[PDB]
């Protein structure tokens, strides 16, 4: 049923080709590393084997913080992997061609990722922000510290059932209501100046009808409805999809609905 959709989203994989930047100094030729990236996770959390691989062919004096880029665009490690691909490389040929760098970290384009604790801090911030919109922070700020860890460990160890044991609490809402207070979403669009669009939007209408994905877009991004694709988790959902249902079943583990507005493929 709905649980099958949850699993399909959770286990989303992107075939990726990591290639070491041409002007990195190597002891020998570096072979490209192929990897299936988890859509729902973060680059700097799942690429240890990639980091270890290219570090073998580099002197200790030449290794620095690792950073990635796609066609000249530094990849923000704090954006979920699936979002980055959808937004940047979905219309290009598979596999995803990511160039691996070490030197010349672009300070103006990327936040540093100094440790995995930094990642866990960012992930918990996103969850907390999401739940603020959903339950006025009532659900996540009443959880034990043990539960905040189970969420994180669930994400890190690719443990679906472990993660949803806790995350299901964040997907429920009071009986008298028919949805969350506000729906946690972010609308991305490369042609636009702003990083993303995030505003307040209620899932239920006045007469008690469920707002749709189309209603949300009509309200906060009418320009995307004239020609463009509406891409969430690599698929294009019908606009008539209930927004409340989407928030529950197609959110990332951070509880946000990351939506990409991209042009339709040329050929």
């Amino acid at each position: 049923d709905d649980k099958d959709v949850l699993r399909d989203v959770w286990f989303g994989r992107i075939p990726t080709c990591f290639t070491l930047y041409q002007d990195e100094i190597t002891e020998r030729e570096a072979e490209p590393y192929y990897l299936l990236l988890p859509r729902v996770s973060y680059l700097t959390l799942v690429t240890d084997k990639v980091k270890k691989h290219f570090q073998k062919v580099m002197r200790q004096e030449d290794i620095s913080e690792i950073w990635f880029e796609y066609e000249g665009t530094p990849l923000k490690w704090h954006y979920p992997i699936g979002l980055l691909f959808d937004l940047l490389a979905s219309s290009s040929a598979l596999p995803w061609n990511i160039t691996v760098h070490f030197k010349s970290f672009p300070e103006k384009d990327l936040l540093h990722c100094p440790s995995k604790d930094a990642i866990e801090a960012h992930f918990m911030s996103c969850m907390k922000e999401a739940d603020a919109l959903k339950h006025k922070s009532q659900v996540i700020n009443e959880m034990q510290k043990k539960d905040h860890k189970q969420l994180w460990m669930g994400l890190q160890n690719d443990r679906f059932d472990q993660f949803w044991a806790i995350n299901r609490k964040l997907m429920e809402y009071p009986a008298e209501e028919n949805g969350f207070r506000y729906i946690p979403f972010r609308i991305y669009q490369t042609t636009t100046e702003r990083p993303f669009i995030q505003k307040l939007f209620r899932p239920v209408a006045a007469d008690g009808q469920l707002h749709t994905l189309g209603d949300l877009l009509k309200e906060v991004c009418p320009s995307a409805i004239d020609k463009n694709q509406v891409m969430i988790h690599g698929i294009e959902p019908m606009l008539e999809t209930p927004l409340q249902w989407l928030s529950e079943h197609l959110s990332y583990p951070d509880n946000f609905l990351h939506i990409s507005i991209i042009p339709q493929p040329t050929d």
């Binding site: 959709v5 299936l36 019908m238």
Partner: protein
């Protein structure tokens, strides 16, 4: 099952077939001979 929910299930399965299933074995083989 609602029209839009069937659509999502089908698209997700199509996505996995094109993106994961197509590359899974070849990547697994390449990783060996490395």
């Amino acid at each position: 099952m609602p029209r839009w929910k069937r659509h999502i299930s089908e698209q997700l399965r199509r996505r996995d077939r094109l993106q994961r299933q197509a590359f899974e074995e070849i990547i697994l083989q390449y990783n060996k001979l490395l």
